[PDB]
């Protein structure tokens, strides 16, 4: 259990729909940009909550999964376990290299499993992150490929880019959000 | 509670931004930010310790200056913001016009001795699109 930073990693296609030459704004479970990823070396239970990101550099140690550089996104949504996959030919020993890799869907399994628990199956290194219901602006090229993305929760600039649906913003003052102060306690009389 | 506006000089100039928390006491919003008490938290955001209370709300990231210029991005009351050297985002009370001292005298008149033909323009939106909708 060590620590790594996810440098724009964990982006995937939200659906089976072709869109092109466009910025698509959507809320879904995504690995937040620069979230903390736990590093592992070698079989502990690593809790699964609201979607899990998994990756490994192996060597071929991770040869199975239990739910009850090769990288994947596993999410439990509306009765299905969705699995996304992708792979970078980069030789790294103990860290996720900084990088972006849009993942493509592999499975959509109708499994009535309350997945709260996750464990990797290790034969004879890997990383785990968590997804959050953040909003992203996904940049689609002319062939329906997501080549880039903006995490709308990262900073006020990113938020403004999402609000105006652009990577280029003109001059001015724009309302992008609304804030609320949250309670420090509970008074019952 | 209140709105949040993001103030930008335009990305063609700079991607640098300032944030206005509207209709709030600056002391309180600053505390909530440091106390992790705001709902729309920005994960890598930092105030930069340049917080200015204006009638419109708490303006964070703009420097306050004692100079004045023509209004560019209005904030509220007499405060406007723009991109200036001290470039950075600055807030200031806007200028109303040039400072002109006109003499008054009961025996003196100024009379133009030359002129300039000038051509200016006006633009007017005479028409809009003729849309049509099939209700059913």
């Amino acid at each position, epitope marked *: 259990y060590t620590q790594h930073t996810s440098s724009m990693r964990g982006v995937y296609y939200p659906d089976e729909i072709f869109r092109s030459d466009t910025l698509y704004l959507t809320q879904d479970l995504f690995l937040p940009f620069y979230s903390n990823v736990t590093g592992f070396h070698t079989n502990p239970v690593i809790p699964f909550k609201d979607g899990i990101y998994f990756a490994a550099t192996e060597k071929n140690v991770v040869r199975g999964w239990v739910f009850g550089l090769r990288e994947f996104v596993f999410k439990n949504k509306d009765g299905f376990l969705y699995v996304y996959k992708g792979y970078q030919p980069i030789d790294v020993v103990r860290d996720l290299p900084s990088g972006f890799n849009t993942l493509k869907p592999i499975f959509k399994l109708p499994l009535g499993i309350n997945i709260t628990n996750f464990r990797a199956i290790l034969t004879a290194a890997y990383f785990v992150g968590y997804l959050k219901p953040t909003t992203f602006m996904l940049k689609y090229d002319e062939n329906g490929t997501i080549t880039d993305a903006v995490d709308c929760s990262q900073n006020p600039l990113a938020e403004l880019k999402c609000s105006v649906k652009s990577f280029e913003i003109d001059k001015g003052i724009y309302q992008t959000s609304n804030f609320r102060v949250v309670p420090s306690g509970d008074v019952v009389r | 509670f209140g709105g949040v506006s993001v103030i930008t000089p335009g990305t063609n100039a700079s991607s640098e*931004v300032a944030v206005l928390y509207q209709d709030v006491n600056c002391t309180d919003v600053s505390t909530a930010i440091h106390a992790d008490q705001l709902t729309p938290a920005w994960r890598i955001y930092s105030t*930069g310790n340049n917080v200015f209370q204006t009638q419109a709300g708490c303006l964070i990231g703009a420097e306050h200056v004692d100079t004045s210029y023509e209004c560019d991005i209005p904030i509220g009351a007499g405060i406007c913001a723009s991109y200036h050297t001290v470039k950075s985002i600055v807030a200031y009370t806007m200028s109303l016009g040039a400072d002109s001292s006109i003499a008054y005298s009961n025996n003196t008149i100024a009379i133009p001795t030359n002129f300039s033909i000038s051509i200016t323009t006006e633009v007017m939106p005479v028409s809009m699109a003729k849309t049509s909708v099939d209700c059913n």
Partner: antibody, heavy 126, light 107 residues
Framework: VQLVQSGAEVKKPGSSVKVSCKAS????????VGWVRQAPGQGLEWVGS????????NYARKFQGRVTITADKSSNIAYMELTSLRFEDTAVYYC?????????????????????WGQGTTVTVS | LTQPPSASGSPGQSVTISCTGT?????????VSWYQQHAGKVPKLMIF???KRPSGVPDRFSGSKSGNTASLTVSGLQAEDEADYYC???????????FGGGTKLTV
């Protein structure tokens, strides 16, 4: 790997020059090739880049309508064509390999720094 | 991207150079590199990632990033370090790379 540049070039005040860079003792592979306009006595600025693996490019806004950056992975040589070259464009014109590697349009890894630099192609324009 | 025009200190001194960004460039992305350039020389990469040093660089060179500010530290400054230092960063995909001006360090 050592990037090798052309050099000692002198050009007219309204001209077109193509600067070449070869990857010697290795290949460009997936690395992005960047170009930097450092002017004599001045700091340095980005001109643009090409990624030989994809054929994709990037330009600094100043050169968007002035400089064409290309590469041909089969000769393993990168090129920069500076058109409408002006007096103000005198520079050492360094080329360099970026650490960033692009595998496909949606997959890339590594940082944006540059490890392997050529010796520079000084282009003097009168 | 903004850098001071100069930096200095005694040999053996810890001397730093700062760079300021935005929510792109330095800040927004963890891709801030530094270069050492002696007059007449090709810039040498000194820092690859915000804190990660490339091979071929002595361990007196290190750095970090806080907020939107990057910092280069040369601990145990040598005469051989009289060079300009430049920082650059991933500017986002439209600009791709942005550089500040050089900071000349004097020993």
């Amino acid at each position: 790997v050592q990037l090798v540049q052309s050099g000692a070039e002198v050009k007219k005040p309204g001209s077109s020059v193509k600067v070449s860079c070869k990857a010697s003792g290795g290949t460009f592979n997936y690395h992005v090739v960047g170009w930097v306009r450092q002017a004599p006595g001045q700091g340095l600025e980005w001109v643009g880049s090409v990624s030989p693996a994809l054929g994709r490019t990037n330009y600094a806004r100043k050169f968007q309508g002035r400089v064409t950056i290309t590469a041909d992975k089969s000769s393993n040589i990168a090129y920069m064509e500076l058109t409408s070259l002006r007096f103000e464009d005198t520079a050492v014109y360094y080329c360099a390999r970026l650490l960033l590697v692009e595998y496909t349009t949606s997959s890339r890894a590594g940082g944006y720094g540059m490890d392997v630099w050529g010796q520079g192609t000084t282009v003097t324009v009168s | 991207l903004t850098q001071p025009p100069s930096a200095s200190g005694s040999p053996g001194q810890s001397v730093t150079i700062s760079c300021t960004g935005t929510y792109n460039d330095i800040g927004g992305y963890n891709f801030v590199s530094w270069y050492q350039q002696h007059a007449g020389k090709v810039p040498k990469l000194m820092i690859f990632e915000v804190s990660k040093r490339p091979s071929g660089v002595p361990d007196r060179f290190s750095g970090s990033k806080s907020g939107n500010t990057a910092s280069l530290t040369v601990s145990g400054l040598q005469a051989e370090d009289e060079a300009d230092y430049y920082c650059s960063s991933f500017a986002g995909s439209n600009t791709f790379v942005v550089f500040g001006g050089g900071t000349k360090l004097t020993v």
